[PDB]
Design a binder for this molecule. Structure first.
Ligand SMILES: [Ca+2]
Ligand SMILES: [Ca+2]
Lengths: 306, 48, 98, 78
């Protein structure tokens, strides 16, 4: 459960945030969207499925894992959304159309958000557009993100975290340098001053030769938590695949209702037919001759016309 | 790039994936670590 | 629809990094100097210009592709098959003949 | 002429986007940013020493005076 450089924060300006969005999928037929986020949702601080809460990277002097309840989260695009599910790095919600999708948390003291400019539309399955699926109508094969979090949509690779060299993780001594971490924290420090130097330490260490803090780095050997491939956390010196995680909310084939505009009133005349059509929403009409040539044509009718 | 078949494989689960996408990466610029990059719109979606 | 995975970049704090080629699809990684990148905590390298960074990116099928994937097929002269119902006097039978 | 950003250069041999001049960080080995910047009191993550120095909160009351005035170490307070 890492953190990433989020294009937008509570301030439109980009900033680092615990819940950076990484990818957005919307191939559903109901307009539900699957969002992968830097935070881990539905797992406790230990890594067990406490579905009522989520875990995310720190926002302070050490990269510890903090917990919060789901009810402070909110997946919102133009307006808000029916959050349909969550698991680990993935959130699922059905949202209205909008130019962007935003994930936000409202903890007051820890009130953050993240946005990715992503064009989401009110796509509809079938051959007749609708604002809302109809009650009575033909059922057609459609695909939707299965609300069952146990389902598997695929997998994402992941890796051990690299160095997270806090600015406060190190010190300067009015002309000298120092490595001052918390008590008992086995911290690796590395610094080139005249020549390459490195050492593991657990307490304040007066550096030799170094003068400016920018000369040095330091990061503890905390690999206990794996990290997704996401760009904003530098890879470890070894970037081999660490297992996998199943992508939740499998895109599952199913059936969805589609409307059936009032049957067109035909009119019969010499080698020609007239179709009187009536559909309050855009509706696809297609006609083809069964002859040697198709002479096929397609037209989205609207309203009432002939 | 930017056309149908920009990414292809013998089968969806297969590792034999080949692709042409004009993917190119710009020199990191912002203070924060980043990897700004650009690509043609997904040719499959463009054809869609 | 391809998914452009941008695996977290490799960084080096005292030297260059080879653009070791990979079999990944459209693997087109580039190495850049003068990166001196920060992270939430701060700078992640020792020096200034001596640090270099390798940005790595390639593409894989988006997870949803499993369903909406365009199977390209070449077509060759189709052989017609027909299901025929035949009746002859009071006797009748149904069959399928290529 | 000016360097590619048409903005100030630090003597470390690199020009910097002038916005970073008072971001609270120094992006060069030279004195270039906070040396000519306005700094508010330390953040909630930091400790305000009596000399006005800002130090990491976890370092306060650890046994080593971090800020020059040593306000971070007081065995009657710590
Ligand atoms: Ca700065
Ligand atoms: Ca101290």
């Amino acid at each position: 459960p890492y953190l990433g450089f989020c294009p937008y924060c509570r301030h439109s300006a980009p900033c680092f945030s615990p819940i950076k969005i990484e990818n957005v999928w919307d191939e559903s037929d109901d307009g539900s969207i699957r969002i992968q986020v830097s935070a881990q949702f539905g797992y406790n601080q230990a890594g067990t499925a406490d579905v009522t809460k989520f875990r995310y990277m720190s926002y302070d002097h050490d990269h510890d894992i903090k917990e919060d309840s789901m009810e402070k989260i909110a997946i919102s695009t133009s307006g808000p959304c029916r959050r349909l599910g969550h698991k680990g790095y993935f959130l699922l919600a059905q949202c209205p159309p909008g130019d962007s999708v935003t994930v936000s948390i409202t903890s007051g003291a820890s009130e953050n958000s993240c946005t990715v400019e992503k064009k989401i539309r009110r796509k509809f399955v079938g051959r007749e557009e609708y604002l809302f699926p109809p009650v009575q109508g033909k059922l057609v094969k459609c695909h939707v993100y299965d609300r069952l979090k146990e389902t598997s949509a695929g997998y994402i690779t992941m890796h051990r975290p690299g160095p997270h060299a806090y600015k406060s993780y190190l010190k300067e001594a009015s002309g000298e340098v120092y490595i001052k971490p918390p008590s008992g924290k086995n911290v690796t420090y590395e610094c080139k001053c005249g020549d390459y130097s490195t050492g593991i330490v657990s307490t304040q260490t007066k550096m030799n030769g170094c003068t400016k803090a920018r000369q040095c780095i330091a990061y503890k050997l905390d690999q206990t938590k794996w990290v997704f491939n996401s760009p904003d956390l530098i890879r470890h010196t070894d970037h081999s695949v660490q297992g996998k995680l199943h992508i939740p909310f499998r895109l599952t084939p199913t059936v969805c209702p589609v409307p059936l505009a009032h049957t067109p009133t035909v009119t019969k005349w010499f080698k020609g037919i007239t179709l009187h059509l009536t559909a309050t929403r855009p509706t696809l009409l297609t006609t083809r001759k069964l002859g040697l040539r198709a002479d096929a044509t397609a037209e989205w009718i609207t309203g009432t016309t002939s | 790039p930017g056309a149908f078949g920009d990414i292809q494989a013998s089968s969806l689960d297969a590792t034999d994936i080949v692709a042409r996408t004009d993917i190119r990466l710009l020199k990191p610029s912002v203070k924060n670590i980043h990897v700004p990059y650009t690509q043609a719109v997904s040719g499959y979606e463009m054809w869609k | 629809r391809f998914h452009t995975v941008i695996p977290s970049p490799q960084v080096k704090c005292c030297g260059s990094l080879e653009c070791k080629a990979s079999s990944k699809a459209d693997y087109t990684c580039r190495v850049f100097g003068g990166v001196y990148p920060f992270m939430w905590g701060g700078a992640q390298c020792f020096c200034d210009s001596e640090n270099t960074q390798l940005s790595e990116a390639y593409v894989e099928f988006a997870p949803d592709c499993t369903i909406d994937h365009a199977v390209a097929l070449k077509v060759h002269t189709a052989a017609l098959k027909v299901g025929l119902r035949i009746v002859y006097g009071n006797t009748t039978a149904h069959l399928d003949t290529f | 002429a000016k360097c590619e950003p048409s903005q100030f250069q630090c003597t470390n041999g690199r020009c910097i986007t002038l916005l970073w001049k008072c971001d609270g960080d120094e992006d060069c080995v030279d004195g270039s940013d906070e040396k000519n910047c306005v700094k508010k009191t330390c953040a909630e993550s930091d400790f305000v020493c009596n000399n006005g120095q800002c130090v990491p909160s976890r370092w306060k009351c650890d046994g080593d005076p971090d800020c020059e005035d040593g306000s971070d170490e007081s065995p009657e307070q710590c």
